[PDB]
């Protein structure tokens, strides 16, 4: 069977696929038709359909997994749009997470004879996460902070190595925010989780803008002056609060100015959404780091799609944490952020 | 002069003000005609020009505070209106905190020989508090809690003992939010704040169902249904997820349903507003939990006016913080919640 890992989440299915290049002559004969064309048509496309999308510059070249070597895919498509994926499926053992493997089970057991198998979300995400980490991104670090965050003259992509991982504070920001503490391989735990994710903002800015779109909202947000919407301390002290050590440009109330009218009437669309991007940003990183005080762990690295083509949120995060902690948290990321679940799910295939 | 505690935040500016009620036949004949003609308007109406507002439910009687009987009275009006209560002056000291204690130290020094002395919010929320429970509410009790918060059939509010109020964590939901440990008389400190309070909900309230006060948010969130903005756990996974403990009514992504635009188009006004108070609410509860468990803090107590005449926000922070903790936190209400910060300021008097 093709080799897959999925990750059915509440937005968007997320897939891993290992394409075998040392395909003997033998092979090639033996395999059946159905699969030529499989392999073919993800390979000679890089958009499926209408909303499949495969991420070209995340592809992992002459990995060697399962005593086979071959190039590992990565590719994404709207929840939404699974019941067109089963039905072009119906026209195998199929190893996924997430909770549409629980909530569609049934409707991927419309492809007679397949065997579905559930795996579980915290597994996947820390498996696929260290083997990603340990095949490196093809001889490139896995994993980058951003040096020097406080001054932008200075501030740059950087790789940070994981070689020993452990203590590690993963963030995963997808529709919600998940926060989970690896102490060891075999040892880690969800902490907690928060409901203002990347679904919030992706909702919220809809409302607000009537953008259509994640990309959409985000080169609004590019454009826009969320202290249009905000109320910041300088705006109730007329100054810093050096009591508290609160710089006067901290946001002290998100959207606080908006309770007056003439504000309201006076705000972009522009500056809506990258209040609403800040908010959330800035909320995740403040739950980032009350979790990590309280687990004792100095190494935050964040996952999910909330980041992806998302450089604002990623350099806010970076800054945030830095400043906030006094410099005691660093913010990790990763370049396979999105996609971890299913690797790892995928990695659950010899155990069947 | 008069007897007047003034906390000016970045919304509201709180007054309290102790009427003397051991006047004397002599002390009468001394007093100015100004002080006669103040007395009498602040005791004889409970609306004072078009914004300013009596919580005559709040006042204590024969107090005896600074050796004189006397009763303490609370009153508040925007900050947005403090220009005409200064002009309304310039036609005494004055001890008051808050951000607009600062903004505005040059605007009440226009008022000729007044003396302004700013005092920290910090000291004066933690004396307010501990003075208020100490004098008790009329006899009846300063604190309160709702018993039984899980079973709605059960759940009533009920009074606390704050006679040994330490440790204490206080979560004062203004604007913003601030949050506070108060381990001693002496010792207390401000743990950090959020972002995302009262003025988030007014905010962005106003911006999606175009309410024009906060009574009237809260009444339009009073026959919303939250679930049709969100996400819920269940619309993930299809039900609970028992492996993290996460039942199927909770919150997966706050406003996450509006990434559809078929929801966006039939979500209610209603709707919107319930999950703007519901979002907002539980993130406050959430990161006054996550404080508690790092602070080592038992018993959380909320404040500010983000509570007042909000009985939604008190028994989903009730509901949420028992729920949530395991039943090892609990939730812990004030009757003069929003007013601490300028009784505290009032009785920084006798410094001066
Ligand atoms: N093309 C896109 N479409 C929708 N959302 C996107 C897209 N690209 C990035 N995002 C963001 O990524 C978030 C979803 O991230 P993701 O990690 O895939 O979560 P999920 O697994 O689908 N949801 P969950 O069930 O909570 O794990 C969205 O809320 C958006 O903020
Ligand atoms: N009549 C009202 N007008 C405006 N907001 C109200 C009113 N009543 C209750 N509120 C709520 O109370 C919040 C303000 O609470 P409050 O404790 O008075 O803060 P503040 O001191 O004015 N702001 P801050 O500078 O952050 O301390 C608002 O954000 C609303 O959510
Ligand atoms: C392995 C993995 O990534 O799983 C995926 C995942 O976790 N999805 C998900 C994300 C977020 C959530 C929300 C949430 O966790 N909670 C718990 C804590 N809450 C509160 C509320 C009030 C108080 Cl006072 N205290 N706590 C808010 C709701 C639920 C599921
Ligand atoms: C005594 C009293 O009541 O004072 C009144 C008061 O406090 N007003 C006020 C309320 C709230 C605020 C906001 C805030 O505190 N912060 C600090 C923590 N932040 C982050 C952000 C990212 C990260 Cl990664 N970490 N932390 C967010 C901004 C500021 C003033
Ligand atoms: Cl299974
Ligand atoms: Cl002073
Ligand atoms: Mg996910
Ligand atoms: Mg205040």
């Known amino acids: 069977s093709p080799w897959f890992g999925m990750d059915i989440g509440g937005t968007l299915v997320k897939l891993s696929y290992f394409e075998p290049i040392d395909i003997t002559a033998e092979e ?10 499989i392999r073919k048509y993800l390979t000679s496309n890089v958009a499926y359909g209408s909303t499949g999308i495969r991420d070209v510059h995340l592809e992992l070249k002459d990995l060697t997994l399962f005593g086979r070597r071959g190039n590992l895919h990565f590719i994404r498509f709207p929840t939404q749009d699974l019941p067109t994926f089963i039905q072009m499926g119906r026209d195998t053992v199929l190893c996924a997470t997430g909770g549409g493997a629980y909530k569609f089970e049934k409707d991927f057991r419309t492809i007679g004879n397949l065997h579905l198998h559930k795996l579980d979300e915290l597994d996947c995400l820390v498996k696929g996460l260290l083997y990603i980490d340990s095949v490196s991104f093809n001889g490139q670090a896995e994993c980058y ?91 109730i002290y007329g100054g810093d609060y050096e009591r508290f050590g609160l710089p006067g440009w901290a946001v002290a109330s998100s959207f606080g100015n908006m309770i007056y009218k003439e504000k309201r009437e006076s705000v972009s669309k522009e500056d809506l959404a990258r209040a609403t991007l800040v908010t959330i940003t800035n909320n995740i990183g403040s739950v980032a780091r009350m979790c990590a005080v309280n687990e004792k762990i100095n190494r935050v690295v964040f996952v999910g799609n909330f980041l992806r083509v998302n450089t604002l949120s990623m350099k806010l995060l970076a800054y945030a944490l830095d400043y906030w902690s006094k410099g005691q948290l660093k913010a990790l990321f990763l370049e396979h952020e999105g996609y971890f679940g299913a690797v790892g799910a995928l990695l659950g295939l010899p155990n069947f």
Chains 1, 2 share one sequence.
């Open 28 to 37: 090639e004969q033996e395999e059946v038709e159905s699969l030529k064309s």
């Open 145 to 235: 902070y951003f040096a020097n965050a406080s001054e932008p003259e200075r501030c740059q992509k950087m790789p940070f190595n994981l070689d020993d991982p452990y203590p590690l504070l993963v963030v995963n920001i997808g529709s919600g925010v998940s926060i989970l503490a690896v102490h060891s391989k075999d040892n880690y735990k969800r902490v907690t989780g928060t409901s203002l994710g990347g679904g919030t903002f992706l909702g919220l800015c809809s409302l607000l803008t009537g953008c259509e779109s994640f990309e959409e909202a985000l080169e609004m947000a590019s454009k826009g002056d969320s202290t249009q919407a905000d109320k910041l301390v300088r705006d």
